[PDB]
């Protein structure tokens, strides 16, 4: 990904590189399940 | 140690990964309809 | 369709299990006068893995 190459070869081969990586990842997941339940009773939505 | 070469000889890796998770909830009584039902 | 698991474990356990990943409605409706029902309903969708 990130390589900065300085090369001499003709006179001498002298290689000087600054190799840097910056990675950015953002993941956002927003899920909303709605369940209709009796009162004081259990009801269950399961999505899997 | 060298001021001009330390950056060229100091390898820095800094990573900040921050994930926040939050759960809301709202109950809408269906009795408003269930009493009428 | 009925997704099984066949664990045939010689020394006494033959888990010839199966379970149908079927759409389904299992309903127990109770009918109240104004053409209403309070029903215990299992509403399941499942599917072979």
* Helix (H) / strand (E) containing B33: helix B31-34
Comparing CA positions, the residue from A33, A32, A46, A35 lying closest to residue C46 is: A46
Taking the C-alpha atoms of residue A17 and residue A3, their distance in angstroms, rounded to an integer, is: 6
Side-chain-side CA neighbours of residue C37 (13 Å)? 7
Helix or strand or coil: residue B18? coil
- B31 contacts A36? CB cut-off 8 A: no
Comparing CA positions, the residue from A21, A29, C34, A1 lying closest to residue B14 is: A21
| Full DSSP string of chain C | -EEEEEEEETTTEEEEEEEE---EEEEEEEEETTTEEEEEEEEE-----
User: Mutate which of A25, A32, A33 to test chain B, going by most B C-beta atoms within 10 A?
Assistant: A32
Query: Phi and psi at residue A17, in whole multiples of 5°?
Result: -125, 140
Query: Phi and psi at residue C6, in whole multiples of 5°?
Result: -105, 95
Chain A neighbors (3+ CB pairs < 8 Å) = B
| Token representation of residue C20 | 């149908």
| Token representation of residue A13 | 């081969």
Residues of A in contact with B12 (CB under 8 A): none
Neighbouring-strand partners of residue C31:
C37
Locus of tokens 């190459």: A5
CB atoms within 10 A of CB C20: 13
């Amino acid at each position: 990904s990130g390589i900065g190459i300085g090369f001499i070869t003709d006179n001498i081969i002298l290689d000087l590189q600054l190799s840097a990586m910056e990675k950015t990842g953002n993941g956002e997941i927003v899920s909303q399940p709605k369940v209709v339940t009796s009162d004081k009773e259990t009801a269950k939505i399961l999505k899997g | 140690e060298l001021p001009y070469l330390g950056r060229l000889f100091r390898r820095d890796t800094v990573t900040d990964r921050k994930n926040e998770l939050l759960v809301f909830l709202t109950p809408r009584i269906m009795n408003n309809q269930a009493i009428a039902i | 369709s009925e997704v099984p698991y066949q664990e045939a474990s010689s020394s006494g356990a033959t888990s010839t299990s199966f379970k149908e990943a079927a759409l389904s409605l299992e309903v127990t409706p109770q009918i109240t006068p104004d053409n209403r029902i309070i029903v215990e309903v299992k509403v399941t969708k499942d599917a072979p893995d």
